[PDB]
Every structure is written in structure tokens, then in C-alpha cells.
DNA sequence: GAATTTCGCGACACAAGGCCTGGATGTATATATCTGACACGTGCCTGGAGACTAGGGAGTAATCCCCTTGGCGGTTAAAACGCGGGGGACAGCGCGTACGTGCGTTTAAGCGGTGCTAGAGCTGTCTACGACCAATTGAGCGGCCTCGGCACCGGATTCTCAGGCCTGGCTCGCGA
DNA sequence: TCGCGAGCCAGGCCTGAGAATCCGGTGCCGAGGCCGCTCAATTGGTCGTAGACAGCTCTAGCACCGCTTAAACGCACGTACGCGCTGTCCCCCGCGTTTTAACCGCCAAGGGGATTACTCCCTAGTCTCCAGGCACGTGTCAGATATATACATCCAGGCCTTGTGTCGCGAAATTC
């Protein structure tokens, strides 16, 4: 489903970042990068959840998974 | 880039040009190739064609036949390839 | 007909998106992606909705920061178009 | 006739030599005086254990070496071989130190 | 037809690139010396270990309900695709200045020894200070209401990119 | 080189199409207030002890001195590479049309999150014992340091080769 990150969506994300002209090989690279980052967040979220003997990955677990890697997230705390 | 003799050879069909007219071939190498038996330009052309236009094989055969070095073989191969591309 | 030279529509889009704040990835494709990735670690996981919202906010912010740094790299090399080599350099310097 | 290497080879010899050794690369006394000078801006009359100054120097050298590795990657990115102040500023700005 | 002279041929010479060969240099390698830093033995003493107890924290079931998953029907906004084109990426070339290279000179870092005293470090006293517990009460959280700041929608008014046309100067080209 | 015809490009005037913004209206639902409650903060007393303070010891941080030489410094010189510029081409961008599946509201089921009660066993706490590991002293060999030696490597000089330019002389054209 990684092809779900539609090319116009990545174009919009770049537009937000101040990019003006985008190459063509960029899209596959961004999908790869997003796959890696999502793996590295969901692994810790799932580990936290498996620890507390729950089957629901609540919001605080995702906030903590981020908070470990240095990308503190506000607004869902919680 | 390209020697004048190379341009003169590639411009027109070889016909009956002596082997010494080839780019990268002087008097000594021309004499040696004549002594081996290759006494005409088209003979070298046919030998080049037999090797199916392979650069390494052509240069190695030329080196082993008369003692040509990298520059001479490179020039002769380039001239022959261009002649093929222009007439063949 | 009336048609802008390329580059100006890019600037209008840049200002429009830097003015607003809504999400830039359609929600359902991202939700199915999240479930697909989590399907390899635990099999029967049910995500709270707000958890997926937070995951999406984090991913968008990370990608926006990444493209900011990539754009700095691209302008460094006297270009205007980013390339995979730009992104690879940005991630290499950042420490990953 | 004189022996004189082409510009570029002595650089590579120095690169190999300094990547094979481990000794400190900044002379000790200038750095010690610099450390004391900076410290006097905050609170006067401080005394430094010698091991503390050594630790500070190790940290500074490692930081500068890392900075120059990343700056060199940035410079090679721009299809050059020289590193320039804009290279250092870009490396720092990406790293997030500024 | 003969003499002479202009265009082309071979000897003479030169220039550029490649292959062969060698010296100076630095690196690897083997052999010797020596010394101080790592490995080992030993006393002791403080921290680890064994027994036993009390109680509170976590396990586990029971129970409620909430909120997550699944599915459906409409409706669009948004994705997917294609095509024309223009501007950006990229290679290539030339220059000049700025950085590498080396050598003589200065300079101040580094090593050695000494002098000292300010302050880290350890110990003794004991007093102010924070834990703990009982009673108590008012500050703050849960729930309900309302109404107005703002989202939404429509409609003007100004702003902005683009281009088309005209004016103007510039340039090209043939003959005197 | 100028006269003069003609066209190509540079720049401004002007307008249009589309976007951004300002203005007004409606409605709507979320923020701000109000009440009931209940439990967490407050206050008072006691008591054990953490650490503030005073004092002594002795270590090491600081300052100084002199000597030697490693390294920094300044200068000159060469070249190579960063920057500027141009030409090429291809491939993202802008737009229109078609397709598709995201979004929204509604439904319903039940998986599991959260809460509470009872139970029991795991751990903090204390005492008593004892040996594992720390501080100290002592030996020896691994690596530091030197020395010479052998060899890989860098870079320049030398010689072979091809390509080319050129001038006296052969071959052919021309006039008398």
C-alpha cells in the first residue's frame, strides 16, 4: 500500500517545505524514506503496547515512541 | 581530435588505397603488415570485420601482427569504424 | 490561451501551502499504510484513531523538515531542482 | 630536476599519516590559555584540573574533525574539492546547531 | 622545339605522444636494547549473602460500556494520463588568482626542576528542616447552557502575471 | 567606408484573465460561565537526621626559571581549479479530460479498556556472618626507540614512432 502516498501528495509536501522544482526519481526515494521512518516509529509504539498487555496502540504510546527519538510531539498529551 | 590522414581516408571509399594510407599506420608498420601478407587496405578492413568490430580483439591482433602500440591501434580502429559507418 | 510561465504557479502554491496548516496526505491511504507496516510485528492490533492522527502529524513534520534541508542542499550546488543525491546527502549529514 | 611533488600528493601523504595516528593536534598551552580566557568571562578566579582541560581539548578536536568530515561531504556535493566558509555554514545549518 | 619557371616529390628536419629505464624517496621488515607499565601475591575490611518477618503491590476474575472495526450509498474533490514547451541541468572551455610546496628564520612550546599555598577532602557537632499523620474545608473538576467569534458563503475591488503592439535604435548588406 | 532599404530585437503602454482580498450576512458550535460535589491541600504537632559549619591535613594548581629544538612564520613560485560563460536537450510543469476512491453520515456488533474486590507471595527491612575485592608492593616482557636493510613507488630523462612542414629538384605548362 506504500503506493498510497500519491505523487501529488509528495508534491504538496515539498511545496510546503519551500521547494520549487522537483525531480522525477524523488518520489520513490521519499516513499523509501517514509517507509523507514514509519517502521522506526511503529516498532517502538508496538513494543510499548506489547509491554502493557494491550491490543490497542493508544495515542500516548505513539507520543512516547516519538519522544524517545528526539522528535517530541505536542498536542496529543495526554 | 582526428588526424588529417584519418579524415582523408574516411571521406571516400578505400578502393585500392595502400595499407600505408591508414590512419595510425606509418611506413614501418605498413611495411610490416605488407610482409605479413596484408598488402591492401581492404584486407585490413576484412580482418576487422571478421572480428565483428570488437575493439580489444582488433587492437590486440594489430599489436601482435606488427607491434603497434595504443595510439596507433586506436587511430586505425577509429578510422576503420568510421569508414564502416560511412560506407558499409 | 492565458498560461503562466512555469515557476509562477509553483510560487503561488508555495505561498498557499505555507499559509495554511491542514494535512497534506489523504487520511485513508495513510491509515492503510500504517496498518500494513504494523502487520509484521503484531497481528491483531487495533489503533486508536487519535494514534493514527499523531502518527500522521509526525510523518508530515518529519518530511517537511527533510525537504527543507534538501532544498538547502540543492541551492548549495547552484541548482533549483532537488535530486535523490540531495536527499541522501541531507540524511547522511543529519546523522542517519 | 629538483624533487617537487605535484600539488596534491603531499596532501594525500599527510591525510594517510594523520588518519593513522591518534595524538592531539592542537598545541597544549595555546588551548589552555584560550580555555582560561573564556572561563574568566563567567566567574573570575577559577582553577582547572589538568585532566579537565585535557577532556575539553579532546572534545574540541573530535567536534572539529566531525565538522570537517561533514563539510568535506558538502563540498564534494557541489562538485568541488576545496572547502569554503559557505560549506561549513551549510554543514552546521543542516546539523541543527544554528 | 627549347629554355624557364611553377607545382608536386623525397630528404631533411622538428614536434608530440608513448614505452623503457633508472634514481631518490618513503615504507615495510628484521634485529637489538631497555624500561615502565601490566600482571600477580597478600592483608583486611566493608559489602555481599543467608534467615525471617510483615505487609502492601500486583495478579486475576467480574462487569460495563465505549469506541473501533466493517460495511454501504452518494458525492464529489482529487488522482491519473497525455501533451506541448521552455527553462534548467550539464558538459565544455578559458582564465587568473589563490593555495600548495619548499626553505630560511624566529619564537615560543615543551621538558626539567623548585617553591608555595589555596583549597579539595575528611571528620565532629548538632540544629534546623522535612517526613508523617489526623482533622478539616474550600479550590477545582464534572456537567449543563448560551451566544458570539468565527467558519462558511457570496460578492465586489484591487492586485499581478502575461502578452501584444508600437516606437525606437540597432544591424546587415550592395554598390560608389 | 557611407547611403539607404529593410528587418530584428528592447522596452514601455495598455489591457485582460485570473487570483487575493475586503465586506457583509447567517448560522453554528465551541468557549466561558455557573452549580454540586469531593478529595487534595492546609495546618498543627512530633521526631529523626541531612547537611551547615568549624577545623585540620596535605595535594596539586599556579608561578617561575632556564634550555633546546619543533614548529610556526614569512616569502617566493608554480599551476590547477573555481568561476564565468555558452551551447545543448530533455523532462518537469501547466492545463484539460477522464476516472476513481476519499469523505461523509449512518448503521450495528462486540473486543477490549477501564474499574473494583479479593488474595497471596515478593520484597523491604533487620541482623549476623564472612570472603571478594581493593590498596599496596614487586617482578618481566611488550612495545617504544633505534638501527640498518630491502623493496615499492613516483617522476623524470631517454629513445621509438607518427605526423607534418619545407626546399632543391623532377614533371609539365608557356612563350618566342
Curated annotation (Swiss-Prot), chain A:
<dbReference type="GO" id="GO:0003723">
    <property type="term" value="F:RNA binding"/>
</dbReference>
<feature type="modified residue" description="Phosphotyrosine">
    <location>
        <position position="27"/>
    </location>
</feature>
<feature type="modified residue" description="N6-succinyllysine; alternate">
    <location>
        <position position="7"/>
    </location>
</feature>
<feature type="modified residue" description="N6-succinyllysine; alternate">
    <location>
        <position position="55"/>
    </location>
</feature>
<keyword id="KW-0832">Ubl conjugation</keyword>
<keyword id="KW-0160">Chromosomal rearrangement</keyword>
<feature type="cross-link" description="Glycyl lysine isopeptide (Lys-Gly) (interchain with G-Cter in SUMO2); alternate">
    <location>
        <position position="55"/>
    </location>
</feature>
<dbReference type="GO" id="GO:0000781">
    <property type="term" value="C:chromosome, telomeric region"/>
</dbReference>
<dbReference type="GO" id="GO:0032200">
    <property type="term" value="P:telomere organization"/>
</dbReference>
<feature type="modified residue" description="N6-lactoyllysine; alternate">
    <location>
        <position position="7"/>
    </location>
</feature>
<dbReference type="GO" id="GO:0032991">
    <property type="term" value="C:protein-containing complex"/>
</dbReference>
<dbReference type="GO" id="GO:0006334">
    <property type="term" value="P:nucleosome assembly"/>
</dbReference>
From Swiss-Prot, chain B:
<feature type="domain" description="HhH">
    <location>
        <begin position="19"/>
        <end position="34"/>
    </location>
</feature>
<dbReference type="GO" id="GO:0160049">
    <property type="term" value="P:negative regulation of cGAS/STING signaling pathway"/>
</dbReference>
<dbReference type="GO" id="GO:0005829">
    <property type="term" value="C:cytosol"/>
</dbReference>
<keyword id="KW-0238">DNA-binding</keyword>
<dbReference type="GO" id="GO:0006979">
    <property type="term" value="P:response to oxidative stress"/>
</dbReference>
<keyword id="KW-0945">Host-virus interaction</keyword>
<feature type="modified residue" description="N-acetylthreonine; in Barrier-to-autointegration factor, N-terminally processed">
    <location>
        <position position="1"/>
    </location>
</feature>
<dbReference type="InterPro" id="IPR036617">
    <property type="entry name" value="BAF_sf"/>
</dbReference>
<dbReference type="GO" id="GO:0042803">
    <property type="term" value="F:protein homodimerization activity"/>
</dbReference>
<dbReference type="GO" id="GO:0000785">
    <property type="term" value="C:chromatin"/>
</dbReference>
<feature type="modified residue" description="Phosphoserine; by viral VacV B1 kinase, VRK1 and VRK2">
    <location>
        <position position="3"/>
    </location>
</feature>
<keyword id="KW-0597">Phosphoprotein</keyword>
Curated annotation (Swiss-Prot), chain C:
<feature type="modified residue" description="N6-methyllysine; alternate">
    <location>
        <position position="85"/>
    </location>
</feature>
<dbReference type="GO" id="GO:0003677">
    <property type="term" value="F:DNA binding"/>
</dbReference>
<keyword id="KW-0488">Methylation</keyword>
<feature type="modified residue" description="N6-succinyllysine; alternate">
    <location>
        <position position="42"/>
    </location>
</feature>
<feature type="modified residue" description="Phosphoserine">
    <location>
        <position position="49"/>
    </location>
</feature>
<dbReference type="GO" id="GO:0010467">
    <property type="term" value="P:gene expression"/>
</dbReference>
<feature type="modified residue" description="N6-methyllysine; by EHMT2; alternate">
    <location>
        <position position="19"/>
    </location>
</feature>
<dbReference type="GO" id="GO:0016020">
    <property type="term" value="C:membrane"/>
</dbReference>
<feature type="modified residue" description="Phosphothreonine">
    <location>
        <position position="43"/>
    </location>
</feature>
<dbReference type="GO" id="GO:0070062">
    <property type="term" value="C:extracellular exosome"/>
</dbReference>
<keyword id="KW-0379">Hydroxylation</keyword>
<feature type="modified residue" description="N6-(beta-hydroxybutyryl)lysine; alternate">
    <location>
        <position position="42"/>
    </location>
</feature>
UniProtKB/Swiss-Prot annotation, chain D:
<feature type="modified residue" description="N6-lactoyllysine; alternate">
    <location>
        <position position="20"/>
    </location>
</feature>
<feature type="modified residue" description="N6-acetyllysine; alternate">
    <location>
        <position position="20"/>
    </location>
</feature>
<dbReference type="GO" id="GO:0040029">
    <property type="term" value="P:epigenetic regulation of gene expression"/>
</dbReference>
<feature type="modified residue" description="N6-acetyllysine; alternate">
    <location>
        <position position="86"/>
    </location>
</feature>
<dbReference type="GO" id="GO:0010467">
    <property type="term" value="P:gene expression"/>
</dbReference>
<feature type="modified residue" description="N6-glutaryllysine; alternate">
    <location>
        <position position="86"/>
    </location>
</feature>
<feature type="modified residue" description="N6-succinyllysine; alternate">
    <location>
        <position position="20"/>
    </location>
</feature>
<feature type="modified residue" description="N6-(2-hydroxyisobutyryl)lysine; alternate">
    <location>
        <position position="28"/>
    </location>
</feature>
<comment type="subunit">
    <text>The nucleosome is a histone octamer containing two molecules each of H2A, H2B, H3 and H4 assembled in one H3-H4 heterotetramer and two H2A-H2B heterodimers. The octamer wraps approximately 147 bp of DNA. Interacts with TONSL; CHAF1A; CHAF1B; MCM2 and DNAJC9. Interacts with NASP; NASP is a histone chaperone that stabilizes and maintains a soluble pool of Histone H3-H4 dimers.</text>
</comment>
<feature type="modified residue" description="Phosphotyrosine">
    <location>
        <position position="5"/>
    </location>
</feature>
<keyword id="KW-0449">Lipoprotein</keyword>
<feature type="modified residue" description="N6-acetyllysine; alternate">
    <location>
        <position position="43"/>
    </location>
</feature>
